[PDB]
């Protein structure tokens, strides 16, 4: 018998924390409607009264209304849904005092699941932004149409960043292989003012094109090894884990 | 006889550093 | 357990009036969160284009695109626009019609613009 | 006779360990509906009563509700499913106390089988990971376009492994036979950072292509005999037993 | 046992308005688990391709593919893409349309991308 | 996500067999070939198709002018231990070129 | 006002013997936000059609 | 008259070991 715990503003609003191995003692008074609230997204499956006639039941989605329709209506309500099955011990109150206007549920496991995920996301963002112990390469040269040149260019061993001035059109950057052929490389545009193009590869030679102008970028300290990606993310402090299982 | 023109190739002469000054995104 | 005269055939059909309905001026709602028709987005083509087979194109905005009021940057620079062409050229044609379908801002905003792609000076295709 | 045991929170919530050669003692009272649950994923076949009218039967998938409809309802309910056949001895209580709101089953055989499955999987994974008694051949030479070369290549006698640095694109690897022809060989990408390409064959000569650059790999200690696969798996400590019978 | 006037036909037809409905901007939900349109996956062709008969193809990713925000590796390197071509070539065509249909990460992740296969610089087919 | 990768051969796996029957495309017909190598699972840890397994396919419709390859569909494979699986897969040359 | 932006379109190309294309202007946007749907023929500098 | 080109055949001159150092996957 979990007895609904009354609120601080009114006695008519009582809260109960769910417990699968316990029941709900609902003290209904005569001539009121008790509003039981399910969890959001919970799909009602089936219910079963002790007397189908003692209480009047009408349900709309996750909203439950019951109403006594007889004297000495002491029965039970076992409403079962896809997620769980509720248990009520409907004990009629004879003096019509201390009513129960709505029964609200608290789910401990769901709250723990939601707070664990939020804390994990906070830790993930903190670890992504902390960006500790990275090594930067600044030995980059350029030759070509200098009017489309970046004002800076470097890499951290995983991505290559080209920083452009505020007035310069952002050009298109192409990956150049040993024979001189060019191929697309994926890029993400980062920076406070979107002035940095981050390409997802470290390469010795690059190609920058804007219209009919071309600039060649040369990595003068190419590291054929680099640092391995053991975690699955762009940071050494955030692991990518398999959720789907299956 | 006729083939699709290649884009401009940059002149390999004026090779100068991209980084005149250390960026601030490197915290320097 | 649970509860439950008419002649003049030619001259009179040439004198048939052409009545065009008038128009009434409206007003744009919020001009700080709006990019109107005919605004020119300047992007740089990424994918080399060959019109043998139908295909998907890709270009990246070079400049920030401001609202009509010219006060808020609505499409950041470096946004990725995605388009497509199809149908090939006919004899005598030298321009392919490219439709751009969607643009994705670096901050995550995604808007379905289904707009003709033009050359650097707005000539079609 | 199985008497279900009450929980420590409410005495009206009882569980019982299924025993196929024994009935359960169901202590129903007047006006209180009892919820009976079948196991997850069970198909109800048919039920049969000692008295149809003494109790009211309502079912929804794996959920069953019963409730007395007459005095002296001392009868039985026999319900059969594909997995088993449940036995119920319904004994009405006179004084309307000690009711049974919900009865649950603890199946011992299904969890006993699920424990053998998990132990088997743990043993198989341990056997695969142990990789004991393995002989390695590192006598590999290469010649060609060295810019797509691995940083290491070896074999264990069953697979050939090519290890690539973090900054290198993973190329295509082909199987070269005596006449010099190339043919496809299956591969799996292994290693923590997905840097190793394991091809499923030991061969004297290999070929590595990426774009328009080619490299040839030569096995300098080729063993035609190899080690036979008497088990059916990649490891000498895991069998592959025929389950299909037939 | 069991219980239970209208004239001006040409000029008035040429003045019919072209009303194109506006668009409303959205926002991408999780960009750490998203590979948006137009992303360029660089794979290396495994099977030699001869277009006499329709057939299945196969290519392996050469590089890790990152999420839109570029922080999570979504498609590992060495994943196996599978696609097909059909219909052969016509006269005057030097490119075949290859559609890639599925990709399989080395860790077991499978996603149906029905995308066009292009050349090294995006040229269709 | 794939369910069990120790009991799975996924799309695009390259089975290497050796053609047994000499092939002449005058008449529609049925072919046959034998796997030369053990075919491992996707995880590369269990031998799912043994060597010597007998694949059975067929062609039809002949060639057209300008074509130098016939389309062969492989229909079933039967492992030396008894296992039978209906792979309806295209037949390719040694490097995967169709037909 | 001046500086209003007008938007139009054409289609169908030219036939032989034609040196003018029919342009229809669709909408106009005043620099203060006014928008009126004028669907009017576009002419040359002296009102010649197309 | 014309036949399909063969892919590049690597030169057989600069033959060197692949393994300069023992891999760590061998655990050595």
Numbering used by the authors:
A (entry chain Q), D (entry chain N): 21 to 266
B (entry chain R), H (entry chain O): 17 to 44
C (entry chain P), E (entry chain M): 150 to 153, 177 to 297
F (entry chain J): 199 to 297
G (entry chain S): 248 to 297
Sentences from the paper on this structure:
Conjugative type IV secretion systems (T4SS) mediate bacterial conjugation, a process that enables the unidirectional exchange of genetic materials between a donor and a recipient bacterial cell. Bacterial conjugation is the primary means by which antibiotic resistance genes spread among bacterial populations. The recent cryo-electron microscopy (cryo-EM) structure of the conjugative Type 4 Secretion System (T4SS) encoded by the plasmid R388 revealed that the remaining VirB proteins form a large assembly organised into four sub-complexes: the outer membrane core complex (OMCC), the stalk, the arches and the inner membrane complex (IMC). Previously, we solved the cryo-electron microscopy (cryo-EM) structure of a conjugative T4SS. In this article, based on additional data, we present a more complete T4SS cryo-EM structure than that published earlier.
Unsymmetrised C1 maps for the entire OMCCs are obtainable, however, they are often of insufficient resolution to derive important structural features such as the TrwF/VirB9 linker sequence between the two layers or to derive detailed information on the symmetry mismatch. In this study, thanks to a larger dataset, we were able to achieve high resolution without imposing any symmetry constraints, enabling a more in-depth investigation of the OMCC. In this map, the two additional I-layer binary complexes of TrwF/VirB9NTD and TrwE/VirB10NTD are inserted in diametrically opposite locations. Clear density is seen for 14 linker sequences (residues 128 to 150) between the two domains of TrwF/VirB9, which we can now confirm is mostly α-helical. As anticipated, the biggest impact of domain insertion in the I-layer is observed in this linker helix. When the angle it makes relative to a vertical axis is measured, a pattern can be seen, with the largest angles observed on each side of the insertion (see complexes 2 and 10 or 8 and 16 in Fig. 2A). The angle tappers off the further the complex is from both insertions (see complexes 4 and 12 in the same Figure panels). Clearly, linker helix flexibility is crucial to accommodate complex insertion in the I-layer.
